Design a protein around this ligand. Structure first.
Ligand SMILES: Cc1cn([C@H]2C[C@H](OP(=O)(O)O)[C@@H](COP(=O)(O)O)O2)c(=O)[nH]c1=O
Ligand SMILES: [Ca+2]
Length: 132
């Protein structure tokens, strides 16, 4: 079983780890897989929100990639990896210490090792959430 990115259409960025897509012609919230950004009113929340917003809004295009397992969560949100001009937003947040690796469920964990490699680098550099 292989993962494949597909073309996506942005309506708007919502916060650090959620975006609104026009998915098959319906507005739908997507939650980024394997990451957790702070809430806007928590430390680094505004920064994570603005980093995801600039990355998706300013991209020439965005793509979504489901993993192998559940595609929608218990709140109806789609669960995907999101790419902006080919760069994974989920990884970039982690690499900048603006999200933690989190919500790792077996069966939607394809990019776990990639993301924990990014988090280890953000922790070594003491970035943001990991700053001292
Ligand atoms: C990332 C992700 C979150 N979730 C759920 C778990 C958390 O629900 P509960 O705590 O209600 O159990 C919720 C966290 O989302 P937010 O971080 O967007 O608040 O989203 C999944 O079910 N699957 C996922 O892959
Ligand atoms: Ca969150």
């Amino acid at each position: 079983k292989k993962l494949h990115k597909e073309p996506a259409t942005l309506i708007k960025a919502i916060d650090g780890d959620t975006v609104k897509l026009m998915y098959k012609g319906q507005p739908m919230t997507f939650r980024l897989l394997l990451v957790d950004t702070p809430e806007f009113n928590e430390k680094y929340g505004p920064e994570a929100s603005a980093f995801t917003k600039k990355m998706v809004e300013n991209a020439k295009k965005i793509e979504d990639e489901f993993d192998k397992g559940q595609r929608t969560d218990k709140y109806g949100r789609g669960l995907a990896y999101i790419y902006a001009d080919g760069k994974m937003v989920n990884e970039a947040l982690v690499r900048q210490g603006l999200a933690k690796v989190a919500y790792v469920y077996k069966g939607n964990n394809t990019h776990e090792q990639l993301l924990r490699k990014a988090e280890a680098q953000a922790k070594k550099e003491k970035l943001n959430i990991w700053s001292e």
